Design a protein around this ligand. Sequence first.
Ligand SMILES: *[C@@H]1O[C@H](CO)[C@@H](O[C@@H]2O[C@H](CO)[C@@H](O[C@@H]3O[C@H](CO)[C@@H](O)[C@H](O[C@H]4O[C@H](CO)[C@@H](O)[C@H](O)[C@@H]4O)[C@@H]3O)[C@H](O)[C@H]2NC(C)=O)[C@H](O)[C@H]1NC(C)=O
Ligand SMILES: *[C@@H]1O[C@H](CO)[C@@H](O[C@@H]2O[C@H](CO)[C@@H](O[C@@H]3O[C@H](CO)[C@@H](O)[C@H](O[C@H]4O[C@H](CO)[C@@H](O)[C@H](O)[C@@H]4O)[C@@H]3O)[C@H](O)[C@H]2NC(C)=O)[C@H](O)[C@H]1NC(C)=O
Ligand SMILES: *[C@@H]1O[C@H](CO)[C@@H](O[C@@H]2O[C@H](CO)[C@@H](O[C@@H]3O[C@H](CO)[C@@H](O)[C@H](O[C@H]4O[C@H](CO)[C@@H](O)[C@H](O)[C@@H]4O)[C@@H]3O)[C@H](O)[C@H]2NC(C)=O)[C@H](O)[C@H]1NC(C)=O
Ligand SMILES: *[C@@H]1O[C@H](CO)[C@@H](O[C@@H]2O[C@H](CO)[C@@H](O[C@@H]3O[C@H](CO)[C@@H](O)[C@H](O)[C@@H]3O)[C@H](O)[C@H]2NC(C)=O)[C@H](O)[C@H]1NC(C)=O
Ligand SMILES: *[C@@H]1O[C@H](CO)[C@@H](O[C@@H]2O[C@H](CO)[C@@H](O)[C@H](O)[C@H]2NC(C)=O)[C@H](O)[C@H]1NC(C)=O
Ligand SMILES: *[C@@H]1O[C@H](CO)[C@@H](O[C@@H]2O[C@H](CO)[C@@H](O)[C@H](O)[C@H]2NC(C)=O)[C@H](O)[C@H]1NC(C)=O
Ligand SMILES: CCCCCn1cc(-c2ccccc2)nc1N
Ligand SMILES: CCCCCn1cc(-c2ccccc2)nc1N
Ligand SMILES: *[C@@H]1O[C@H](CO)[C@@H](O)[C@H](O)[C@H]1NC(C)=O
Ligand SMILES: *[C@@H]1O[C@H](CO)[C@@H](O)[C@H](O)[C@H]1NC(C)=O
Ligand SMILES: *[C@@H]1O[C@H](CO)[C@@H](O)[C@H](O)[C@H]1NC(C)=O
Ligand SMILES: *[C@@H]1O[C@H](CO)[C@@H](O)[C@H](O)[C@H]1NC(C)=O
Ligand SMILES: *[C@@H]1O[C@H](CO)[C@@H](O)[C@H](O)[C@H]1NC(C)=O
Ligand SMILES: *[C@@H]1O[C@H](CO)[C@@H](O)[C@H](O)[C@H]1NC(C)=O
Ligand SMILES: *[C@@H]1O[C@H](CO)[C@@H](O)[C@H](O)[C@H]1NC(C)=O
Lengths: 749, 748
Amino acid sequence: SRSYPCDEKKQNVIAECSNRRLQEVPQTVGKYVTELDLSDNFITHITNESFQGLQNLTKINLNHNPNVGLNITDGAFLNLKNLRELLLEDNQLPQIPSGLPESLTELSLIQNNIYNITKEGISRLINLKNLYLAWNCYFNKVCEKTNIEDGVFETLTNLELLSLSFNSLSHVPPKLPSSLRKLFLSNTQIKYISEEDFKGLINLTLLDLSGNCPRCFNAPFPCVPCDGGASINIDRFAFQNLTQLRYLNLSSTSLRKINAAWFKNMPHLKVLDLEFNYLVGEIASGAFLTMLPRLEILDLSFNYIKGSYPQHINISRNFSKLLSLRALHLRGYVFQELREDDFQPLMQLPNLSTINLGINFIKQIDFKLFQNFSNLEIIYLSENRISPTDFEFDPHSNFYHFTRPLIKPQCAAYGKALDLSLNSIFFIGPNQFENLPDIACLNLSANSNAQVLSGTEFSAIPHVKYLDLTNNRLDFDNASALTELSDLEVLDLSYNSHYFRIAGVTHHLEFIQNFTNLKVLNLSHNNIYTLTDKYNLESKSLVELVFSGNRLDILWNDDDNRYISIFKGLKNLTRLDLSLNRLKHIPNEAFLNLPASLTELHINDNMLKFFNWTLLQQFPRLELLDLRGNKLLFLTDSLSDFTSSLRTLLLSHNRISHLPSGFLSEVSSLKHLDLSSNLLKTINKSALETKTTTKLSMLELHGNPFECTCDIGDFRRWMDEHLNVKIPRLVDVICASPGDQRGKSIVSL
Amino acid sequence: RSYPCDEKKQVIAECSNRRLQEVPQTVGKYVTELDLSDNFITHITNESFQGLQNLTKINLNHNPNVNGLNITDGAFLNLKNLRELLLEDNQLPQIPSGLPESLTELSLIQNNIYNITKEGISRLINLKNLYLAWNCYFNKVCEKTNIEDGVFETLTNLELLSLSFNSLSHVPPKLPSSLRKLFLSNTQIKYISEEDFKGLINLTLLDLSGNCPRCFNAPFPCVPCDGGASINIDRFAFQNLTQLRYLNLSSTSLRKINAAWFKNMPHLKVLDLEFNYLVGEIASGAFLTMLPRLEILDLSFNYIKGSYPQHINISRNFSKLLSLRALHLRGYVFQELREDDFQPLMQLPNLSTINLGINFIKQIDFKLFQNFSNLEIIYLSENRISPDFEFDPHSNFYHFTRPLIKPQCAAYGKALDLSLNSIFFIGPNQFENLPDIACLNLSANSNAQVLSGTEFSAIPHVKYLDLTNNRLDFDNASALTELSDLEVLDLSYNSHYFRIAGVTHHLEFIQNFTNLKVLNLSHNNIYTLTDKYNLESKSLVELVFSGNRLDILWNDDDNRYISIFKGLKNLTRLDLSLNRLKHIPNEAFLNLPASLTELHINDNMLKFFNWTLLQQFPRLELLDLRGNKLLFLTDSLSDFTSSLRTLLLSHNRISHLPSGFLSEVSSLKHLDLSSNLLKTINKSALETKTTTKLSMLELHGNPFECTCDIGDFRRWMDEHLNVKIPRLVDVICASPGDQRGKSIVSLE
Ligand SMILES: *[C@@H]1O[C@H](CO)[C@@H](O[C@@H]2O[C@H](CO)[C@@H](O[C@@H]3O[C@H](CO)[C@@H](O)[C@H](O[C@H]4O[C@H](CO)[C@@H](O)[C@H](O)[C@@H]4O)[C@@H]3O)[C@H](O)[C@H]2NC(C)=O)[C@H](O)[C@H]1NC(C)=O
Ligand SMILES: *[C@@H]1O[C@H](CO)[C@@H](O[C@@H]2O[C@H](CO)[C@@H](O[C@@H]3O[C@H](CO)[C@@H](O)[C@H](O[C@H]4O[C@H](CO)[C@@H](O)[C@H](O)[C@@H]4O)[C@@H]3O)[C@H](O)[C@H]2NC(C)=O)[C@H](O)[C@H]1NC(C)=O
Ligand SMILES: *[C@@H]1O[C@H](CO)[C@@H](O[C@@H]2O[C@H](CO)[C@@H](O[C@@H]3O[C@H](CO)[C@@H](O)[C@H](O[C@H]4O[C@H](CO)[C@@H](O)[C@H](O)[C@@H]4O)[C@@H]3O)[C@H](O)[C@H]2NC(C)=O)[C@H](O)[C@H]1NC(C)=O
Ligand SMILES: *[C@@H]1O[C@H](CO)[C@@H](O[C@@H]2O[C@H](CO)[C@@H](O[C@@H]3O[C@H](CO)[C@@H](O)[C@H](O)[C@@H]3O)[C@H](O)[C@H]2NC(C)=O)[C@H](O)[C@H]1NC(C)=O
Ligand SMILES: *[C@@H]1O[C@H](CO)[C@@H](O[C@@H]2O[C@H](CO)[C@@H](O)[C@H](O)[C@H]2NC(C)=O)[C@H](O)[C@H]1NC(C)=O
Ligand SMILES: *[C@@H]1O[C@H](CO)[C@@H](O[C@@H]2O[C@H](CO)[C@@H](O)[C@H](O)[C@H]2NC(C)=O)[C@H](O)[C@H]1NC(C)=O
Ligand SMILES: CCCCCn1cc(-c2ccccc2)nc1N
Ligand SMILES: CCCCCn1cc(-c2ccccc2)nc1N
Ligand SMILES: *[C@@H]1O[C@H](CO)[C@@H](O)[C@H](O)[C@H]1NC(C)=O
Ligand SMILES: *[C@@H]1O[C@H](CO)[C@@H](O)[C@H](O)[C@H]1NC(C)=O
Ligand SMILES: *[C@@H]1O[C@H](CO)[C@@H](O)[C@H](O)[C@H]1NC(C)=O
Ligand SMILES: *[C@@H]1O[C@H](CO)[C@@H](O)[C@H](O)[C@H]1NC(C)=O
Ligand SMILES: *[C@@H]1O[C@H](CO)[C@@H](O)[C@H](O)[C@H]1NC(C)=O
Ligand SMILES: *[C@@H]1O[C@H](CO)[C@@H](O)[C@H](O)[C@H]1NC(C)=O
Ligand SMILES: *[C@@H]1O[C@H](CO)[C@@H](O)[C@H](O)[C@H]1NC(C)=O
């Protein structure tokens, strides 16, 4: 049938029931459901009856109930004989619930109020593979020191992952099972790591001891250093028997000195995180660098000496021993100048593909040094000074750094990438790119660049294919701009509105036609409303034009003809975005002059009161039409007369009060119709008049003010009979009248 | 209570933009000025104003609002005192027939009138001001304007005539000599003869701009004279224009200005010559000797296309402009300004404003601004220094008329605006040899430096400093402290480094200012500070903290910022709008300065507000909680404040009003409950023994139930007519249907 209140669907069966304002566990769930997600509802109480007839559930998620404490009686879950993954995060739980099923393999209890880790609660769960207990007591939270009953984990003999981070521990719990692979103990106020602490865990691949004896200067959180800001104290033989270790996080442990012999017996170490320490000394001289022959990722970010600004970065020769190194991060070291000889030790590494020098206030760089490298793919120099919920930190993300790729992947994919974003390159000199290697992806966003590009500024790197010049203040006064880059495929000129705003300066966009291979052009949020000389955009190649956040309302205004064909010369164009252009009306001749090659057309978030549906006869490839967030007052009754290509029609956030007789099913093409957040109070039988298939497989109707009287029943039978038409969010397809039905789903009466 | 207009005296009916479909027949019969603009009115007849004799002014602009306005012959003619009639933007195809002989002002701007006729105009002999601009222009489909010979001749009191933006081709003959102001911009007149203005001895303003326009880079469809020739003005065309004060010749494609045009023009004060081709004349400039009483000279946008000369070339004869107060040279385009290039201007005694905006200037020898007698405004924005219808028919077409520098900044003294330049850091000699500057603009220079307490030492008296839209790195606690006289500091939109956790942010310098009155930290995304977590000043009166992250600063797991504003002991005004606050901790709220009079927490997401806590705020006059998610008010609000005059609660989720709330506090003049969820206002809500001192209660936008029991509130309204409820048309019944859309003030 049609499931309510959850949306149920099957994979190699999952009832997503989240964020639905549910007051208690709905009882109408399907029977063959394996994975239920009740996250973000308003459930206050779980008992042994809440999931009575669903013994085929292997996964329940009750995270963030009740959002804006959750009461769970003992053994509530005890009957669920297949339950393996139980997620109870962010629930103000005061203790680990009693009587959890011996079946559990995964138990998350992140972001609760649990300070007593106890055998009664945990020792029964001998199938546990992952247990997450992070973030129950941290920062200035009002909470107790955490109590870990002795030997509480030693039963958990297939335990592979244990996370106790952001809890007050003081010391590494004794008696962990040697099954452990991943041990997270970040920000647990442990000052001292003894020889005994992990002697037994011979399978460990990840150890996280970060933020114990933190470096607190400029902490974005309440930060409590060890006494005299001292180093975490790691015993000489603490990592002796950790032969399988692959991931070592030692960020913010106030390290000044690394004991090289710590790495003696972990020659498979792949990822070493050493951010926010005091290692300027160790970076220039460290022995430990010789002990890391398989290391792929080394993170030394934010080791700057406070108030210190050395002229040069000082890199030990021993970096030349890091033969497997793939990515080196050296943000926040802070130094003025980068010279060829400062990086000799890295030049011979065969796999060094990422070098990250973000946020170092670098003033000058000798670009020729990147030339002398095996296979640099990513040169990240963003944010230097080159010149011509309810909690703040995601419990599931890295705490010390953003985890996203450095360069957008769609740019990096083209080849070698140079990111000079967020510098002070306000003008591109004639030699600013001399001695660079053959860059394919270049980022110059947010340099306050205010110049007049003219066909020569990129001569030294003519093979750029993806060029980001967003958030600058370019002065488009020359028609040869960027014409030197004849392989250019993607050009992003978003947020260069500064000069476009000014009537009196010129604005030349002619250079666009000069590329034989330009595919994607983003002119968004430029406030374009007047151009000089040539009023039209032209390209034989261009496939996608993004023109959001401009002033087509002025370009196409009734008293001016000059821009009536503005986009017509884009002969290859399939995708066009005209959103956010304050259009109240589009002149018919202007709509007719959009390229007939369009398959996708967005005019969302404007101000349209009317739309000439007849004009779609001229767009025989048009598959997606998006008119969301306008003021449209009705629809045409003749849609099938005007297109046989349209598959998706998005009409949400408009003012439609009536759906025409023979609308739904007369148009063969249409798969997906979105009428959410309109002014429909019913749907007439006659709009449901049916042909073939109807082909409609998705119809959105949430947010309309349906009159839930016996009038609607025609539509209800229709839904009942056309179960191939997915209606999402049934709990939001709600009745506005009369008062007895007000606020309920239309499906529930 | 008037309806549907809002009425008031000195008697004026403000009835605009109200969705009305006919002229209302329920307008007070005393009303003298009536404004019905922006309504949906389609028809006007001799009935529409039948009971409103005594009307002196009617505004019908822009009806119907989103065909046109149909007006019958004689519709208005029974209105015998009617002086001002405004009919702009109504798609009138003709001047309406049989208008009353009493009219002194008639405005027909923005219609489809291409025929000016005696039948329409010639008996309207009391006319002082006739506006017919913008009826045919650009690529509008419209006809060349036909002016019946002599049509203006009987208008012998006509002082102002505006025909701009119509296709005229020639100056109309037979203009009455009572004319003071004649507007003929963009009328396609290529030639001015000696006859055209021969009798106009009272003219103080002539506007001939946009005839033979300079079309290069035009922001509108532009049609040049052939060859781009200049307007052709006869040597004697201004013989008798002895009273002329304003002459506008912008965009007339002038290469050469004939000095003799000014032979008989001793009072010219304002001369506008933008968008011509006058680079040569600026250098040679015979005409200048003719204009020793001129006050304003606008020479902006005379740049030669694709010419970037090294220097500006200013004729020595500029020194004859002895009454010049303001010189505008935007858009000349030149590389460098040397002292010798402005010699001619250095002895002009009243030259207070020099405007060099948008010239792409790279180097300025700043010491040259000392040899000036009394420059008050040095405007150098937008250079290059280093270390319906598009146009408003009531505004200048060739430039914005706002002030160059903000008045609040210029009022302090000499002013220097280097906004939108490329001063990405202030070098150590960036300001030497400047005049004693009191108002300084450095907005939008992409400045990224660590200000450290010496960068402004050569202009140590600045009192208003604008550093907006930069990317400053707040890493030295002595930044700006060399400005001991500083009173206003704007640091808005410097979010760049503020949004990065790993860099330092030191705001300690705030404390060092003995005279700091206004501080703007808006839109900086402030969420973390280094070492010192508190703002402190003994002087500060106003702090703007909108668009930051108080949600993070005061989150529940961190206490370091719980007194962030307590040390602002003198503060009266505080804006916490736009900080994504879902809740304020009680301790953080009680730590706001006890001295506050005006507190804004609008446009957050506050679900709850602790009203109790207003006990700690005995000077609190204005509290703004608009644009939140508040579900309710307290029961006993007088228990908590005796000072509150204005409470703004619009756009919240309040559905029930507490007993006696409308008279509960009695310091309160303004209560705004618009756009909430009130269905009605119960009897218990109006119970008091105190007299209410409320004078404005706002309720539009609540979904009222218009059943018979809204009667009690209707009665209270009827009884409390001192309590203004504006916008009664929008105080609307949500129910029952068939009462839907109607103002609660109707029915049973
Ligand atoms: C110290 O360094 C260590 C070693 O790098 C670091 O360990 C990593 O922590 C992250 C953060 O939890 C782990 O990432 C998770 O891995 C699981 C398992 O596949 C994913 O499901 C998670 O993704 C979900 O959540 C994300 C964020 O909300 C979403 O982006 C996504 O939609 C998912 O729903 C998440 O990636 C990571 O696996 C470990 N690394 C290893 C190898 O185990 C540790 O965090 C550092 N310590 C601190 C305090 O930063
Ligand atoms: C060529 O130069 C001349 C001389 O400078 C210039 O004449 C000026 O035109 C403007 C634009 O109309 C006039 O400004 C108006 O003056 C009246 C009367 O005092 C005001 O009502 C107007 O203000 C209303 O409208 C404004 C804009 O909507 C609103 O901001 C304001 O709040 C009011 O509602 C308006 O200021 C100006 O008076 C004349 N100057 C003189 C001395 O008479 C002419 O515009 C120039 N020509 C072109 C095409 O630019
Ligand atoms: C940074 O914050 C500062 C300080 O708040 C801010 O400067 C202030 O801007 C306001 C404008 O919002 C100025 O107040 C105006 O002053 C004029 C001039 O006389 C008055 O006409 C105004 O009153 C009318 O308009 C108000 C609404 O704007 C109505 O409230 C009023 O009833 C009238 O209709 C108005 O009060 C104030 O003078 C300045 N202060 C200073 C010192 O300049 C600055 O704009 C902010 N910066 C940025 C970049 O946003
Ligand atoms: C300027 O416009 C361009 C082109 O539209 C923007 O780049 C495009 O960004 C969209 C996301 O908005 C990308 O689509 C996404 O790609 C991923 C990766 O396969 C996919 O998982 C997502 O579901 C989605 O489809 C698209 O690839 C990307 N295109 C290019 C050529 O980069 C760009 O972001 C806009 N610039 C700015 C500043 O907004
Ligand atoms: C060029 O650099 C800019 C600025 O660093 C990058 O912009 C960031 O993009 C990410 C990825 O989506 C956003 O989530 C960040 O918020 C952006 N930061 C800012 C300040 O805008 C940009 O993506 C880079 N361009 C490419 C092609 O890699
Ligand atoms: C300093 O310079 C900036 C930029 O020229 C001025 O900002 C403009 O202010 C006006 C007038 O209020 C606004 O209408 C414009 O939109 C603003 N433009 C920009 C780019 O922000 C600023 O007001 C000047 N400051 C002072 C004190 O004069
Ligand atoms: C990695 C972050 C270092 C924070 C301290 N610091 C240092 C500077 C700075 C250093 C050198 C030049 C200019 C500025 N700015 C700041 N904010
Ligand atoms: C006043 C308007 C001039 C318009 C043409 N122009 C000229 C320049 C330019 C000139 C000289 C240096 C840098 C830029 N930029 C532009 N856009
Ligand atoms: C370099 O990377 C290649 C390809 O992934 C891999 O085969 C090899 O192990 C790496 N070389 C070294 C010395 O680690
Ligand atoms: C760009 O193309 C146009 C016409 O297609 C041509 O006029 C112009 O010379 C070209 N400019 C170059 C290649 O720099
Ligand atoms: C049209 O677009 C496709 C890519 O979508 C491309 O292969 C082709 O070269 C384009 N046409 C021209 C003439 O460039
Ligand atoms: C659609 O456009 C054409 C002009 O292209 C026009 O003739 C027709 O009247 C228009 N239809 C509507 C409803 O505007
Ligand atoms: C012009 O300046 C002179 C000399 O400084 C002064 O005497 C005179 O009063 C000023 N006149 C005006 C109108 O400002
Ligand atoms: C407190 O503010 C007022 C208002 O500006 C001012 O008069 C007084 O001097 C201020 N306190 C100082 C400057 O210490
Ligand atoms: C508001 O403030 C008082 C004093 O801090 C507090 O104790 C009271 O519980 C709060 N009110 C609400 C509704 O939480």
